[PDB]
Design a protein around this ligand. Structure first.
Ligand SMILES: Nc1ncnc2c1ncn2[C@@H]1O[C@H](COP(=O)(O)OP(=O)(O)O)[C@@H](O)[C@H]1O
Ligand SMILES: Nc1ncnc2c1ncn2[C@@H]1O[C@H](COP(=O)(O)OP(=O)(O)O)[C@@H](O)[C@H]1O
Ligand SMILES: [Cl-]
Ligand SMILES: [Cl-]
Ligand SMILES: [Cl-]
Ligand SMILES: [Mg+2]
Ligand SMILES: [Mg+2]
Ligand SMILES: [Mg+2]
Ligand SMILES: [Mg+2]
Ligand SMILES: [Mg+2]
Ligand code: NA
Ligand code: NA
Ligand code: NA
Ligand code: NA
Ligand code: NA
Ligand code: NA
Ligand code: NA
Ligand code: NA
Lengths: 472, 421
């Protein structure tokens, strides 16, 4: 289900991916990315590589979507709100003509970008660069504008007989002048705290036939803006265009992730072989390279935690899940097969109700894992009795080697190190320690178990030499 | 070093004790509480015992101290503020009259209360029930005051000066309570009285601590024998009991995490620290030794190379600097690294310490270590046991199980492969 994407911190990979979307359309798709059918995932891989090859820009799709959705509901869209949507459609078509001569997988997506010309040429006639509605837009408005602009110069007009302050302003959307202490008639807008904002008697009557022509201004503009909105809504090209951008935004981010982290195109075969692989979320991550195949199914990692043990289990699993999701994956080169189910046993320490939780996941593996399934097991046999737990831990390893699963196990149990020798299909490996430098490395040593650390600490630490006392 | 005080959460034990001070003076002592010379230790139970037997109450010393501060700085002390210091000084002497006749070690502490009679009769003649200044205070202020006897009411910015006799009056007053502030400063038992009061506050709190947490009264000896001990800081603590003697010196407490095992170590050693500090230990009956040093090897949860190299740095100390009178608390021995060298080193540390004849208590997870511990001079296997997958958390001496059947109680397949030969 989930609980494998959760365990492997896949949503953090989604979080990084959506940070590199340029629209919410891409952002949403990244936040719901998940393992795909194999043809889709490779097609996402091929798309990602080619968007590395030729970068492209995007509209603000999503402002386009939000305007279009409001049009479908039958909002009366704002002028610039139409204009901003109109430009995004215009850039979407322009991107399509940019992308088609590439004649490759980017172009095939871009073929979904519609012909939005009839909406555009409506818009370019209708409204100007600022989103206000032109005189051109209907003839009915043009007569209104022709009867309005000259009337607005009355009042121009501007009488003196001064003593008044300055200017001409309009209050309550009717023209007026400021005056102090006079002797000039009529009907006051507001007052000061001197101004008194006068609305002379002479120019009341032809104020109302400017308010009248104002009410016709909206009554023909709010006809036009609605009609432009319905022309946007009744444009069947926009979904298939919006679908196309959300890919192109997502596939832009699925590549810009790989540029930014060091990710690569995997290929799918019948066995895993990673070349300098690492955890995407670990900064400056140490690069390591292994291979699991039908001869060497299960890789048993013997470990001074905290020196790499759990990160590799997440490193393998996260590369596979990103691969199945169409993401580029965290290697110099990656060859992974395609498990029917990943099984992850990883914690959230280490006594004995961790161990029950470890058993609870392993039982799920023991019942319904096939030879095609990939198993990650952390802290096998720890948290519990080292004697009885060792026999159980071998008992579960035998169950899965006979089962033909592939995957990776981390354990501390020395009786399990002796078991990975001499038993076909499981192999030992460890994590290096510069015990001289008193650090983990975090390299990986294939073939070599987590051999002996404890004495060599002591000599650097100035313990008595009457001790040691070495049994062996 | 007392690192080990910090390690064993001793300042938390101080924090409870200082909470039950009735004065700042006792509160300061409790936060300063240290392991003691043994006579003062064995004394301070005889006080903490008897101050349970005969409880008392204490004055507002501190406010005695701080006001007697400001009259060593020589403020003109406030009118009530001198009365309050006097009230404690009187209230301090009621203790000495009350705490003398029982003759106990409680009584010898009361013998440092001063004979503050000369101060108090100066107070009592001068200044009143309310902290005002009265006529009685002097030849001067009994006059001057009487006098001030006005005339008024002549009726059916009023002339008659305005108060140009009356408004003179004044200052007068001190002098007398500046003299009494100096008399407070120069009184020759006051620092000794404050020492006696603060100690009785400290003993009072320690008596309250004993009742509140269920504490009892160690006796010291040449071997440990703890009887239903527990941890004073673990609420509803399970009780447990053992002996470290010369015969059985070291208790190798096997057993799992969460557990018990890391906090028996604190249970023993904090009782030892709490005893050596003249306090009441966390047990029904407890018999203890007086170790020259207590070494704790306790950390700071999952167990590393770096914790182990931390742990190895404290076993270096014990191997270098522990005698047969030492008490060692060693945690998670050989946890951290491979079992392979991890045991063969951890054994050799045990042998060196069983040779050295220290007495202590160890927690490990190494299987070979508990097959070493069966068959040796004095070292014994214990465990905390386990339940419903619960821990209990009660010791079992003798006894280092249970890796399967978690599995069968989860009903895995079978897959048994119970062949653990
Ligand atoms: N290859 C690596 N590169 C960088 N850091 C790593 C690497 N592997 C592990 N780490 C560090 O170790 C932690 C992961 O725990 P890890 O050591 O893998 O599990 P375990 O404690 O079981 O060995 C992370 O916080 C990370 O910082
Ligand atoms: N005697 C006890 N009574 C009640 N609770 C205890 C007791 N001993 C330990 N605990 C509980 O166990 C916790 C300490 O863990 P601990 O058992 O010391 O770990 P470990 O199993 O590694 O020794 C404490 O939080 C405490 O609540
Ligand atoms: Cl139109
Ligand atoms: Cl014996
Ligand atoms: Cl069975
Ligand atoms: Mg781990
Ligand atoms: Mg090998
Ligand atoms: Mg512990
Ligand atoms: Mg001694
Ligand atoms: Mg030796
Ligand atoms: Na991580
Ligand atoms: Na899967
Ligand atoms: Na009391
Ligand atoms: Na009390
Ligand atoms: Na155990
Ligand atoms: Na505790
Ligand atoms: Na190891
Ligand atoms: Na051994």
């Amino acid at each position: 289900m989930r609980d494998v994407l959760e365990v492997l911190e896949f949503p953090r990979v989604r979080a990084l991916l959506a940070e590199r979307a340029k629209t919410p359309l891409g952002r949403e798709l990244a936040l719901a990315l998940a393992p795909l059918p194999r043809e889709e995932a490779e097609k996402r891989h091929e798309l990602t590589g080619e968007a590395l090859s030729y970068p492209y820009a995007l509209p603000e799709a999503g402002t386009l979507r939000e305007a279009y959705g409001r049009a479908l509901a039958g909002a009366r869209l704002s002028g610039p709100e139409l204009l901003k949507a109109a430009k995004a459609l215009e850039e979407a078509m322009a991107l399509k003509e940019e992308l088609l001569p590439l004649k490759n997988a980017l172009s095939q997506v871009a073929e979904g970008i519609g012909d939005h010309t009839p909406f555009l040429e409506r818009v370019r006639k209708a409204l100007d660069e600022e989103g206000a509605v032109k005189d051109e837009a209907s003839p009915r408005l043009a007569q209104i504008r022709r009867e309005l602009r000259p009337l607005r110069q009355q009042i121009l007009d501007r009488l003196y007989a001064l003593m008044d302050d300055r200017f001409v302003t309009l209050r309550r959307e009717r023209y007026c002048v400021p005056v102090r202490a006079g002797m000039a008639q009529k009907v006051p807008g507001i007052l000061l705290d001197a101004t008194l904002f006068i609305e002379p008697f002479s120019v009341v009557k032809l104020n109302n036939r400017l308010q009248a022509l104002r009410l016709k201004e909206e009554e023909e503009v709010n006809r036009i803006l609605r009609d432009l909105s319905e022309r946007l809504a009744k444009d069947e090209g926009v979904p298939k265009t919006l679908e196309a951008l959300g890919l192109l935004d997502l596939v832009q981010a699925q590549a810009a992730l790989a540029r930014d982290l060091g990710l690569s195109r995997p290929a799918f075969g019948e066995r895993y072989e990673l070349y300098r692989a690492f955890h995407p979320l670990i900064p400056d991550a140490v690069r390591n390279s292994f291979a699991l195949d039908e001869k060497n199914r299960i890789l048993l990692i013997s470990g001074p935690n905290m020196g790499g043990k759990t990160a590799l289990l997440k490193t393998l699993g996260l590369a596979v899940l990103m691969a199945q999701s169409g993401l580029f994956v965290a290697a110099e080169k990656a060859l992974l097969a395609w498990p029917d189910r990943v099984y992850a046993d990883i914690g959230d320490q280490e006594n004995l109700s961790t161990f029950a939780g470890h058993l609870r996941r392993l039982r799920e593996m023991l019942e319904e894992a096939t030879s095609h399934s990939l198993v990650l097991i952390d802290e096998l046999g720890s948290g519990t009795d080292p004697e009885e737990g060792a026999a159980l831990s071998q008992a579960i390893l035998e169950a899965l080697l006979e089962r033909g699963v592939k995957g990776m196990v981390t354990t501390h149990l020395s009786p399990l190190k002796a078991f990975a020798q001499g038993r076909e299909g499981i192999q030992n490996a460890s994590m290096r320690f510069d015990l001289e430098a008193l650090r983990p490395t975090y390299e990986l040593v294939l073939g070599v178990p987590g051999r002996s650390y404890a004495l060599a600490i002591a000599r650097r630490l100035a313990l008595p030499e009457e001790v040691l006392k070495r049994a062996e």
